[PDB]
């Protein structure tokens, strides 16, 4: 479910940008956000602490 | 509600402990016993129960000491602890002060014993009430013990199953037995009358009656059987 939402976020960053082309910098931000958010469901780096 | 039983350590909203009242109930369900006194004697007369007619009744008077004694009404395991505790104190008094234990000081020690279970988590307030008599240096006394731990001096009282009938007898005949002194037979006879009235759907048997007596020149003596057959 993560990977269809990466594409939704990138295309909304790309709207702000106002280009036919979708740059890869938008796909750098989309991953950094989906990834950060799932580490808050794990309450920090709890795998490390167990 | 009734979710304020289940703990003896929680006060209810009304400010009762349900647990101590439920101890008062356990008494009614066991046997009846009657206390009464004069000024020269204190006498206890108790209805003894059996479970079947091969069973030979159950003793409900325990001699505490030769100038003290008690009856029980309610649970029998609860009774054993208190009659044992009470004896420690009477022996202590003989060993340390060479002195007969005073009924009133006895009762407040018993009060204490009870309040120990009441504060504590764990344990129960005792499921038995005792009617305590003695004759000390200040003559005869009779106390009424409760699960709450209240000891109250009375000329006559009764606790247990259908005890209103005995308390009714007692009320009417309060002054008659107070004024009689010197005749041990009459106080014995009067207590007999009270416990007859307490009964409903039963009759007196020679092995129902138990007579317990202490006086001015009467040692503690426990009568049963053919000793309560002069005064049946």
């Amino acid at each position: 479910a993560d990977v269809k939402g990466v594409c939704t976020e990138a295309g909304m960053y790309a709207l702000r940008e106002r280009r036919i082309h979708v740059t890869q910098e938008d796909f750098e931000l989309a991953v950094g956000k989906v990834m950060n958010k799932n580490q808050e469901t794990a309450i920090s780096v709890a795998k490390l602490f167990k | 509600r009734n979710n304020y039983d289940g703990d003896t350590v929680t006060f209810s909203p009304t400010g009762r402990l349900f647990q101590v009242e439920y101890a008062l109930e356990a008494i009614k369900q066991g046997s009846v016993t009657v206390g009464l006194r004069s000024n020269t004697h204190a006498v206890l007369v108790a209805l003894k129960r059996n479970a079947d007619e091969l069973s030979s009744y159950q003793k409900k008077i325990i001699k505490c000491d030769e100038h003290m004694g008690l009856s029980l009404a309610g649970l029998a395991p609860d009774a054993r602890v208190l009659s044992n505790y009470l004896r420690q104190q009477c022996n202590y008094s003989s060993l340390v002060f060479n002195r007969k234990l005073a009924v009133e000081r006895a009762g407040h020690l018993l009060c204490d014993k009870a309040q120990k279970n009441t504060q504590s988590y764990g344990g129960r307030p005792y499921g038995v009430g005792l009617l305590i008599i003695g004759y000390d240096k200040s003559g005869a006394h009779l106390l009424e013990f409760q699960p709450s731990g209240n000891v109250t001096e009375l000329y006559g009282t009764a606790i247990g199953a259908r005890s209103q009938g005995a308390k009714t007898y007692l009320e009417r005949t309060l002054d008659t037995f107070i004024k009689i002194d010197g005749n041990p037979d009459e106080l014995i006879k009067a207590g007999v009358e009270a416990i007859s009235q307490s009964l409903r759907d039963e009759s007196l048997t020679v092995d129902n009656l138990s007579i317990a007596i202490v006086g001015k020149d009467t040692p503690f003596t426990i009568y049963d059987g053919e000793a309560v057959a002069k005064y049946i």
């Binding site: 309450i43 920090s44 709890a46 490390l48 602490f49 | -």
Partner: protein, 246 residues
Amino acid sequence: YSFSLTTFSPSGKLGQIDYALTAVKQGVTSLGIKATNGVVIATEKKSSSPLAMSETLSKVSLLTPDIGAVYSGMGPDYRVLVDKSRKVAHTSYKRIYGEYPPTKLLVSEVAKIMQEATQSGGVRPFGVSLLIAGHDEFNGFSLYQVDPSGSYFPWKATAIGKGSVAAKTFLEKRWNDELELEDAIHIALLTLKESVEGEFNGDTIELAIIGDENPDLLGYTGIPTDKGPRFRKLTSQEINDRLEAL
């Protein structure tokens, strides 16, 4: 499941440990950066009223002269546990080893006090994750994070508290394998100014180092053969200096 220290979960772990972790995240932001001749440790102070004295809060407390600490998590838990930490350090490892203990060893004692406060049910573990940095003559400058889960980890640069997640990428980006202490002190303030703005100033940000031996702090002289405190707390005036040149 989640909700006793005693109960294991279907996928395991105790939940009280996870909830204590949550507490840390509601904390203030403390962060450490290892340089090649130091460790700088930094945190901020808040107190609500401005009528509060800020120099009375303890949050940069030396455990030993060799080893400083900060926290993120519960304020009360800190003072008690700093107190306990010190006490254990002399009993097990200054009456025996004959000097103030190793950075690695002392971090293990701290974890062991936590661990006892997890084993005994109805007794919560400490609200704090500390950063404990120190120096020893064997393993050099060192930095650790000791979690309220009673486990400790060694680290190169790390941050903990509410603002941790924002700070860590700054740390990834800005850390280099060879740094001096003075480039670390400036990187430390810079990152910590992300955590808050409108109130950041040299008298309300508390920052210290565990750097080089200072005989200035030793307080007795004419003994060359021992070293002086590695620890140095920088005053309010120093913190302002560094904030102007940045």
